[PDB]
């Protein structure tokens, strides 16, 4: 019984960690996209 309870708690602890990691990855990807597009447009219009 204790094993059942602990394993359930472990799953309920893992899911939200997955969600937070997904959010962080998404914001990082958006920041990267903005960074390279800004760099390329600046290099292009610097001429």
């Amino acid at each position: 019984a204790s094993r059942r309870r602990a394993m359930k708690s472990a799953t309920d602890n893992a899911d939200d960690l997955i969600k937070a990691l997904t959010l962080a990855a998404n914001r990082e990807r958006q920041a990267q996209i903005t960074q390279e597009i800004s760099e390329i447009v600046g290099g292009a219009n610097a001429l």
């Binding site: 998404n26 958006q30 996209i33 903005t34």
Partner: protein, 348 residues
Amino acid sequence: TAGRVVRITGPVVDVEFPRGSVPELFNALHAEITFGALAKTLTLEVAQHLGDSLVRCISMQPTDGLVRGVEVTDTGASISVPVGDGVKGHVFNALGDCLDDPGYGKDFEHWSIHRKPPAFSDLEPRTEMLETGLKVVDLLTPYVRGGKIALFGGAGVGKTVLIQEMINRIARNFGGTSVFAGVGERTREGNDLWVELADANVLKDTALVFGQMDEPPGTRMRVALSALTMAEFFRDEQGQDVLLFIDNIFRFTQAGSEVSTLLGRMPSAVGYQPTLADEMGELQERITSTRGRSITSMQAVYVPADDYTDPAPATTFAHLDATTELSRAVFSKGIFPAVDPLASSSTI
């Protein structure tokens, strides 16, 4: 009194005009291609004044075969579309030409598409719950007269059945009409939908407008504008409720961004035009409820890889009122009207 073409790079075109005759913004012009086998006429709209009698404009159909120094004429008025009680039961394009029968509707009455939303005083400080014969949706996610309803998750679970259900329900219970607009359409899907509707005997009391997926940018906005023009004409003069079906709200924004990039203005965060919010606000505030009449609407949306924080869905969700979800398990269980009650919610 007639201009000339100076630059022809890309879809964009630069036009030179005599002094004192430069057309205003959002004005129509015609230019005819007569060289080679591929002969046709093109329509252009004024996009920006460059000064010194130079006007930058965007084409509507491909600019292949054009020659420098050709002659061009201006209509003098904005893009016009024919409206009336006889326009239903016929397929139309963005420019108003009737694909089913050319020359149709030439004697109708034409209206412009750039129109102002109503005044502040005409707004009604009330929320009226729109009711229908479906007990599936009334108990959990009630609809709102004049609001917006989100629908996504088709996946071939029978959303066309829902569309025709709404069409016949508004035809019978409320004595209304229906207008369907396609922004990016696969030709086979549109043809199949037309055939199915013809077999269902509901082409009457239903107008259809299509914009093909393979088309130069510029149509993907004007199709929605024309559909809204027809819908508001039905609402006002006839004084009878209408329902607007608009699909593919997503690549409307992509077409706008594409045009903005073509004009050459600097982009914004995550590569978007800097004025998307104003355009989406104009389109959303186009519809409203007044004089006891209303325009409800159902829209299909597509999230960019499940990132709800992307600018496009974030801007879109600022105007929705209710969400409907199409599930792929309830119908496998045998429940023919497919919904996901747990995944659907309403603010009402």
